[PDB]
Design a protein around this ligand. Structure first.
Ligand SMILES: Nc1ncnc2c1ncn2[C@@H]1O[C@H](CSCC[C@H](N)C(=O)O)[C@@H](O)[C@H]1O
Ligand SMILES: Nc1ncnc2c1ncn2[C@@H]1O[C@H](CSCC[C@H](N)C(=O)O)[C@@H](O)[C@H]1O
Lengths: 164, 169
């Protein structure tokens, strides 16, 4: 992937993921967009055969994932932290893509995703420079965790492609 | 949803979906973006408990899905048909990216039905199926690993549809 080096500094950080299936789906979503750098903060369960199954061809993303106890560990070294949630500085996914790719050229960037039902807590959201909301149906705005990663990752790759 | 009526004309058409879980996930992806009109063309098995479970709050999109025997049935009365496929040397076809597809889809759906056609897990659409489409849409991806899960591909396409709609506001 010609995009490999441009994107490798972008950390996808999953906070306290409940289901290993979603970790797998996340690794696939990432990998399709060229993202390789997965961080799991205190997952309920560590990745297992169901995560590997759903990762399929991207099981190497799982295999290389950093698993850490605390969010601060996953954010350590990042010049840009973006949290995703359905008063703070807001980006949309397209702007998040553009900003991430530009900052990732130089330094690590963290794109932080929350728990399947709860999302990110207030204390977690206050660690981010920006928040990203994916514009959605107000009747039903909650994407599946992996689907949300796919949207963000997709806009990251579009941003990279524009630099070409 | 303020988008409801502008997006109502857009049909998501899944061809021969194998796994009921994927029908549910697609229903969820669709609903979150304001799309509600799902067509299943010869599904291997009809939506069951697993579709309903993965649909979560979107089980009404499953509930209201049109199930038909032939792709032609799902395209009948559509002025624009877009199918998901990579660029092909074998069968060259005019290509959109998801962004252009959203823009074309929303412009067209303000007036007439539009069909966004997705293929089988793993293998996609046949050439005969692909020749019923005005355009093909290719999601640009990692050359080492360029196939999205069915429901993920729907999520991206639907996302670009809603972004196109949002542009109009
Ligand atoms: N509309 C949306 N915009 C941004 N992120 C979303 C989203 N829907 C889901 N997510 C991501 O998916 C995770 C699980 S959904 C958690 C509940 C709620 N939808 C929320 O966003 O807080 C979220 O923490 C977030 O990282
Ligand atoms: N990179 C991509 N671009 C467009 N659609 C894709 C895609 N990856 C997966 N899909 C969708 O998910 C379904 C199962 S995956 C099969 C991929 C298909 N053979 C192709 O070339 O596009 C496909 O039929 C398609 O609807």
């Amino acid at each position: 992937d010609p995009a490999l080096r441009a994107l490798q500094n972008i950390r996808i950080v999953l906070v306290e993921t409940s289901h290993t299936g979603n970790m797998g789906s996340v690794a696939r979503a990432m990998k399709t967009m060229g993202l390789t750098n997965l961080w799991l903060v205190n997952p309920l369960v560590k990745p297992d055969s169901q995560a590997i199954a759903l990762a399929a061809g991207a099981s190497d993303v799982i295999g290389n994932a950093h698993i850490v106890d605390t969010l601060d560990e996953a954010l350590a070294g990042c010049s840009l932290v973006v949290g995703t949630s359905a008063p703070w500085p807001m980006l949309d996914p397209r702007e998040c893509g553009l900003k991430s790719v530009a900052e990732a050229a130089n330094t690590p960037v963290a794109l932080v995703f929350g728990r399947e039902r709860v999302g990110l807590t207030n204390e977690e959201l206050q660690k981010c420079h920006y928040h990203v909301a994916i514009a959605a149906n107000p009747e039903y705005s909650s994407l599946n965790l992996a689907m949300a990663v796919q949207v963000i990752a997709y806009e990251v790759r579009m941003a990279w492609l524009a630099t070409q």
